[PDB]
Design a protein around this ligand. Sequence first.
Ligand SMILES: Nc1ncnc2c1ncn2[C@@H]1O[C@H](COP(=O)(O)OP(=O)(O)O)[C@@H](O)[C@H]1O
Ligand SMILES: Nc1ncnc2c1ncn2[C@@H]1O[C@H](COP(=O)(O)OP(=O)(O)O)[C@@H](O)[C@H]1O
Ligand SMILES: Nc1ncnc2c1ncn2[C@@H]1O[C@H](COP(=O)(O)OP(=O)(O)O)[C@@H](O)[C@H]1O
Ligand SMILES: [Mg+2]
Ligand SMILES: [Mg+2]
Ligand SMILES: [Mg+2]
Lengths: 533, 526, 527, 159
Amino acid sequence: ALHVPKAPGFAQMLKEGAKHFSGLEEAVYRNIQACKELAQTTRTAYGPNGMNKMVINHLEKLFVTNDAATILRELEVQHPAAKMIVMASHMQEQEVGDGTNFVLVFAGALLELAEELLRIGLSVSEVIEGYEIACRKAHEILPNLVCCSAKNLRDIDEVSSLLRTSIMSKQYGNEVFLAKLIAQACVSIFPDSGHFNVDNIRVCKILGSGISSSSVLHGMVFKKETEGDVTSVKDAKIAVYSCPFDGMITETKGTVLIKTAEELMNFSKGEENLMDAQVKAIADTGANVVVTGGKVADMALHYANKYNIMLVRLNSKWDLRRLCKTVGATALPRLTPPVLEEMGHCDSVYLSEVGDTQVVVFKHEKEDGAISTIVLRGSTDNLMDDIERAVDDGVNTFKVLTRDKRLVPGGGATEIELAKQITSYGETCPGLEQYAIKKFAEAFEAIPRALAENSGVKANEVISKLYAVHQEGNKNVGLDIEAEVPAVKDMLEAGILDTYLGKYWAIKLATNAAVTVLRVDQIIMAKPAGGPK
Amino acid sequence: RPVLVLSQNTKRESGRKVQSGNINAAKTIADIIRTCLGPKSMMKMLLDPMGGIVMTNDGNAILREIQVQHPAAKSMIEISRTQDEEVGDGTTSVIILAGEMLSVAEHFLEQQMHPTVVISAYRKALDDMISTLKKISIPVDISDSDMMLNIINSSITTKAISRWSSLACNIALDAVKMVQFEENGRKEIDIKKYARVEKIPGGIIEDSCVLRGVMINKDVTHPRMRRYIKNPRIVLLDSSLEYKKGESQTDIEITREEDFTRILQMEEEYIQQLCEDIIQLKPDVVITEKGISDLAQHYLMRANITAIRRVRKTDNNRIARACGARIVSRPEELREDDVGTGAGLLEIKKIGDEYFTFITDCKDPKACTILLRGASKEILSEVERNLQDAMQVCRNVLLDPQLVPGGGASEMAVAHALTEKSKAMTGVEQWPYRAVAQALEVIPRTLIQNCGASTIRLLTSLRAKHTQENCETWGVNGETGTLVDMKELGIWEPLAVKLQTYKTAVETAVLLLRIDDIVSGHKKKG
Amino acid sequence: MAAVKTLNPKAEVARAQAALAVNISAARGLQDVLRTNLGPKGTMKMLVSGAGDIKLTKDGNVLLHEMQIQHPTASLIAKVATAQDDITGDGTTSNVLIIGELLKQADLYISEGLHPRIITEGFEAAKEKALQFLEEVKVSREMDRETLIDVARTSLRTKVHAELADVLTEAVVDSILAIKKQDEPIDLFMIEIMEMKHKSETDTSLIRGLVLDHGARHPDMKKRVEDAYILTCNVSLEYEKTEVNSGFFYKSAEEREKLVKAERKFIEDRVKKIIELKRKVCGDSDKGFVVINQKGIDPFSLDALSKEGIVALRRAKRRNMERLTLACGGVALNSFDDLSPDCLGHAGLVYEYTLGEEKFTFIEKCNNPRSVTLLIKGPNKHTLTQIKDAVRDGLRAVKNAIDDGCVVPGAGAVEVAMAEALIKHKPSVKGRAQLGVQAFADALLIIPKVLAQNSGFDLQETLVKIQAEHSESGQLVGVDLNTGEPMVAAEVGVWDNYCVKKQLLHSCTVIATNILLVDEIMRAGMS
Amino acid sequence: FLQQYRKQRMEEMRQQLHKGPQFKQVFEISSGEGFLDMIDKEQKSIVIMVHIYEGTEAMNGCMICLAAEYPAVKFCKVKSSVIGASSQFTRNALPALLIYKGGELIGNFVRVTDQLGDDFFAVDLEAFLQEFGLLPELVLTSVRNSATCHSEDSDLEID
Ligand SMILES: Nc1ncnc2c1ncn2[C@@H]1O[C@H](COP(=O)(O)OP(=O)(O)O)[C@@H](O)[C@H]1O
Ligand SMILES: Nc1ncnc2c1ncn2[C@@H]1O[C@H](COP(=O)(O)OP(=O)(O)O)[C@@H](O)[C@H]1O
Ligand SMILES: Nc1ncnc2c1ncn2[C@@H]1O[C@H](COP(=O)(O)OP(=O)(O)O)[C@@H](O)[C@H]1O
Ligand SMILES: [Mg+2]
Ligand SMILES: [Mg+2]
Ligand SMILES: [Mg+2]
């Protein structure tokens, strides 16, 4: 009478380390609590007033960022439901590029209100069907909330103004300058053909002079030095070789067979003459720069020096391909001289030092090309990493704008209008799904509430003001950050706009994640064991 | 430090207690599978140390999965294996009989009888048992299909497959009949190599059949190969159809421009020459035990030939027997008589999610594949064991067409005969002789105990019945607990099985009675 | 105590009623876990592996595989379910439920001193009668598109939710109809299932063609071809070394260069053969040339091909040779000894799509493909796994419907009818096997009970309503999962595979009979 | 999908039928000096494989099956308490396939339940060992033939 035995059946057959959570309270409520905890963890880094977080992963690397996706990646979340929500956030990051924190906050709010509805008496199926109905309604409503479109993408000013909002959530203090940089870099890319490639924007981080000294280069920059004695050219004629800059060798086995003294005495002289002839043939085409992906032989380097040819050796194959795209060359597989159409042309190639870093610059005088580089300056490695993340967010925003040009007001205007209209709709439909629809609408308040909390004012006052102002019929009104008192202002005038595609995909993925978590009823976890990878 | 005339790890024990321990260990082994005998037997679940599960009621299968320490138990297990390998049936009976004779011998060993006297009496009794069993046998005409089927039924009526008795009996009879062979005046059956049993879980057990040919778990090497050929001319090979190195060291030395291309072209031409040599015989299917190069596949396909590679040697021999082919290693020596004509159909069909190659219309095959399809793997394994018992019994009958009454009738008849013999012994060995004779009643007793009927009254009735004149075929019904004439019930078992059982039981008893000392712990000294 | 423990002291033995108690407890535990799976209204389970991989599942076989269980009887039941899934592809949860209920009902009489053998005899007689009745009740019917859609719905609705099931039904039915040839067995290998991880789960669809998980490895190759000639080849176009240790020997640099140039002549020959064929077939720039190779292609050959406007892929799957032959219509080649326009396929559109770091190549607009592909699209890996399992179940269901000439009413209606028939036939069974027959009928009745229970309605009342309706009307009425009233499953459109039911009866009866006859369990293979 | 090791199942069924006269059991070492002079004895070419224990049962069965099907190798096992290792080894380093040949270490695998899994079978471990080139590369007699080979007096027919 001092021990409770395990119940006969499945309870006994379970393995030692395994855990079986079944039922509503033991599984659904625990999952909801874990997801709410994750959302609360990432909440404070939302909005322009979001605060950076120092995250140290298991490899001791230090991350200083307020990007939700990066925070979740560096954190090692162990709870399966929170893992599912993190998967949703990462999928949003991959599909769009910005809006991960919105996904996380919305999913957390949805699961919290789902727990409230389950406790008030509603079944899981009713909550799920109400959430799906409300998601369909929100997706139908969203096109009606579009305020203004991009209507131009080759303009420097419009692109900078459009990208300002995306890269003002990160790096709030100085966003105009970063917007100008990213706008110039994106407009340099993106030719008359509608396709825009995100990878065509390169970012080089050179320590030393604060981020205000960063610049945009219409070309490529490599953190290394030239092999030869020549350091600069003015009418570069790069000839790119994907082969080692040496005499090509056999593939089975090379064996120099010597049977007479004459062959022995002439072998090295003949080899040197052959290399000299090859390099002279290369130089005769006007190619004054030779970029090779392979190693550089000593005699080849000597003959390149003799003929005033600059040698750059690129280790990375991706770097070689990017250089070929930038200059318009072709990666030749042999050491043969390049024909006219395979010759890369650049305005200038030179070796220069930035800060204390030796770099090679492939600079174009034309405001065009295929690849543009954003040379990032800074005083800390972490600061430049965060600036790079902001640059990625801006570039992804530009890509989304190319895909769809419609924009909706930011600063909680879209979320509050969505909540108002969904609540109004939910009163009309009778049945037990009205509670779920109303809760889905209410979950949209978590966005302006998070913004108001991070900005330091009372959230309830802001939400009430938003409802009032939208009640008189202004659907472009969001909270005013630049105020120490609860206040609102027209978001369309202020230029605080965010992409329609971002909101659409974020809402869809957040709803899908919340519903999928709610669907789970029983959890059977295996013993953790190991599995580092 | 101690003088230690023997090693410190040497445990030695001797005397009456050693004999008592040996006989008790044998009795324990017999008791393990005592309830697995008879038509109303109950299966046992055995947990293999590798994680497998064996669910069976075969004596040898159960005793094979036991790790024992006492050497007498090891001897009993070896006896079980010997009986199973020699004749294939009667594995529980021999264990039970050995235990019983050892018990009745221990009874005398408690008194002042020397074990050699008991051994001599046992050997006399064994000779008389053999004589009586040969006397009460009856001949069987093996040309009667119904009689052979009835014999097989009585063989498998005590196994789980007894529900599908007609199907299993027909499968076993057909397999044994068409694996029979005779070359150069030497006759054989050879169930071990030919007559393979392939089990595929799923389907229903009634779908099981014996094929007029063989089936292997293989697929054509190339998608464009034909998967259905009417009357194939199968050719079997051992050698690879690739380009491989020789046995010697054969480094080349290339100095001209075109020698590399020449080497590669000669490799291709060698493959073409091999494929042309094979094509010369106009075959339809090529089976080989080793690889087939892709170029070889192209060359064969140019001639509309289906090719299968990496077939195990045993399967290739079985195919050779089935379709009347000959395995050839060097294609240049492919005679016409090596081409296999006789396979009436070749079909690569898909069962479940796997491809199986069927050659299933052979005209007079000498090998076969028994295709088992059942609920799961363990059920199919038990069915395979039962089918093996049936085929072994059929082969035993075909080799020796003698039969003896079953269901404990032969045991009681022999016991009564030896009891009547012992009335004229007048010696001191009459008591062990009579005791070992009466030890044969353990089989009817176990049958009655498993049936559930009352043991004492039925054994008394049977013993009284066997005292009459023409009552040698009177045994006990296994599933109703009633005395019955076994020329009416129709339960018979091969004379060879009974002779082997009695021989092995008495020999085990003698071997274990000859021991009175155990020395253990010494190193192997390898 | 036991003889085994006397022989082997460290032996685990459970004898007599202990064996039955252990086996029946394990079966009841498995049944209790798998009860909630049955029916479209069943609950979902999230299974977390040791490595932390999340897998959402409702399939019975998948759940059995990934429950942390170490029981022998559970292992036998899992093997039976594995065979059931391998052959038929659907019915594993029903298999486990029927086994568990058979054992429970048999124990209900065994605990009253009845010998298990009598129960097994009753089981066999009942199984024979039930098989006869199932033969009587099956609905033989030529299966056009709508019947197959109904069967696929009946499976996929149980595996996934409503809209996803609705999409998957059309996908799988159309795929089966595309790859099926009249009066020929169906080769499910010809329906490739490819995973992408970028759209919503409702974007999964069917491509009347093929999808490859790799693209052109040369940047200068065309990314999109309008009119295509497909050359399915199995020749290594990369550099290969001599099999007999050739090695090179030169006396000067020029000789070395000559040897280097002349050592690639062999592969250049095959590349030039391909190029000449391409030049012959399409002398304009309108038609494209695609070369799919099962073996690698070295960069030199890639450059030589791409200079002629030929897009080439390497390291194709072995099954993809047959798939491309059946879809495009060409001939898979193991050499270029004699190649002509005859051995060229066709494709009305070939293009690649880049997803993250993975390139996918699409081949579409074929003339009349005999092999198509299903593109699973979802936001998460576990979503893709769940959709793949559901698609496997649905494809197996449609194939089973096609193979059989008949389909069987579902929703537990046939279970109720078979139970009624067995009860009617019970008097004709001689002896005490009538108890076994009654146990078998009660066990067959588990399916409607579990369906009603999972729908939330009362078990006994719903079952008695169904039984009364069937008895009074004689129709094949089953459980309605929304109201609990009886419904004619044939009229509604709830169909079950005849082969699945037959396999259920056979396997469940056989394994239950074998387990009941086990008198003791042993483990003495140690020391 | 040749990466899926189709032959693994076939090898499993081949190894299911170990031998005729049972499959014996792994020898247990009960002395540190027994371990020492067990390594010391045998020739250099003879391979000795040792297991330290207190997921062990499955790998023990794997060694049983291998030793049944690889008579040349001398699979054996020992208790961790017999040697008396450190707390870390007796706590979190038990499953360790220790391989010896000629007295020098060749395979020093430890914590094998990670790199070998937990549900692995005999063929899995056999392939894991053979890819290392650590396992060295036949009809069944009736029972025996040979008793002793000492006298070369066999047969002669001198007039
Ligand atoms: N000046 C501003 N005033 C009010 N809201 C703003 C302002 N700038 C940005 N926001 C809001 O901040 C949100 C962006 O938060 P962010 O940190 O980017 O999260 P995510 O990266 O997940 O989008 C947008 O929804 C936008 O409405
Ligand atoms: N229907 C039956 N009635 C009575 N005795 C039977 C019946 N069937 C078989 N027997 C007897 O039972 C014995 C078979 O038991 P079995 O389990 O096959 O032992 P083993 O496996 O060692 O042969 C045979 O000696 C046979 O005479
Ligand atoms: N819409 C439906 N209405 C009523 N019964 C259904 C419906 N769909 C499926 N069923 C029943 O549910 C059972 C299918 O259960 P399922 O989850 O597929 O188990 P398994 O996967 O083991 O086959 C079938 O017997 C079928 O009769
Ligand atoms: Mg953002
Ligand atoms: Mg027998
Ligand atoms: Mg199903």
